[PDB]
Copies of this chain bind each other. A is one copy, B any other.
Amino acid sequence: LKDFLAIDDFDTATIKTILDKASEVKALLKSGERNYLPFKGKSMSMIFAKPSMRTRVSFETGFFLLGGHALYLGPNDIQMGKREETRDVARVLSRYNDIIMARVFAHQDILDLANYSSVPVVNGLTDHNHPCQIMADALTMIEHIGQVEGTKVVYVGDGNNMVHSWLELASVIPFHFVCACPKGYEPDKERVSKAKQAGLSKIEITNDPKEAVIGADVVYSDVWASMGQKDEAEARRKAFQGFQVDEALMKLAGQKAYFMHCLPAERGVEVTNGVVEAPYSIVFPQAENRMHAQNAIMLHLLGF
């Protein structure tokens, strides 16, 4: 496959190989050495439909550390969908660059970019999913717990793009994934069903977070109103009463539970300060691993 649009576009063995390579190249960089430059003479255009810190800095810095040059095309720079159609952007950038990263709104825009591009496309977040984040999260789990297989991962909050990529991972690695969400804020039904069809993981959707978290290896949260839906924050506050991850919830989860959050976090909304800053919080190692997982994904896509 040419592109990295969803984790479960790939098989188990391939995903595990990418995660192994992620550890290997991370260790090389951590050693302080800077003479492994496989991307020398290669370029990446990064299309962003909305501003970013983690995705932007991790991709641009990682690509540089492996020898290439990433271009930042911000929202107003190329105005994809206003000034110019996706299919034309894809066909132009494919003639200049070796790979394209895109963070878009409608998922169909990333499918269109992939379909019309002759070079690989990497998904940097859409309204539907966030595969590179979950790949990083899998690496983080491997480093802290030992493995993803057989763990219990409990997401608390909105059934959103992050939950969809957790469901992708649950389609290629066998674990127990729970989404504790308010009624009416479930993840997409087809995405849940596709994970169940894979037959690897125990998948549960529940409205009771206090029961869901018990025995977790990971309690995961995210904002209740995502980029592109910030005008909905107030009604969601009401619907999401009881879904804040606070110290009491982490105590219910138990002593082996780590806290994870893709970031940015809104303290006092989906999570408390005390949770973010607790010893069991691994949000900053988690953020770092965006660069290491993505480096391995790009290596894979470019034939290394």
Contact = CB atoms under 8 A, between A and B. Distances in A.
Q: List the number of copies, as a whole number.
A: 3
A29 to B, nearest CB: 9
Interface stretch (A10-18, A70-78, A207-215): A70-78
Contacts of A74: 74, 76-77
B288 A83 contact: no
Contacts of A34: 40-41
A274 interface: no
The listed residue with most B CB atoms (<10 A of its CB), out of A52, A53, A58, A72, is: A53
Given A51-B78, A76-B51, A77-B51, A57 B89 contact: no
Contact of A263 (B52, B64, B92, B287): B92
Interface in A53-102: 53-54, 56-58, 60-61, 64-65, 69, 71-79, 83-85, 88-89, 91-93, 95-97
Nearest to A60: B71
Contacts of A93: 53, 57
Interface string A241-278: 00000000000000000000001110100000000000
A100 to B, nearest CB: 11
B57 A64 contact: no
Interface in A192-210: none
Contact of A95 (B78, B265, B287): B287
A43 interface: yes
Nearest to A287: B92
A267 to B, nearest CB: 8
A45 interface: yes
B64 A69 contact: yes
A43 B64 contact: yes
B53 A78 contact: yes
A97 B61 CA distance: 7
A77 B56 contact: yes
Given A77-B74, A264-B84, A96 B58 contact: yes
Closest 9 CB pairs of A and B: A34-B41, A95-B288, A84-B264, A53-B78, A64-B69, A92-B287, A91-B284, A61-B96, A43-B61
Given A43-B61, A53-B92, A58-B96, 9 more contacts: A41-B65, A43-B64, A52-B77, A53-B89, A60-B69, A74-B76, A84-B265, A95-B284, A96-B291
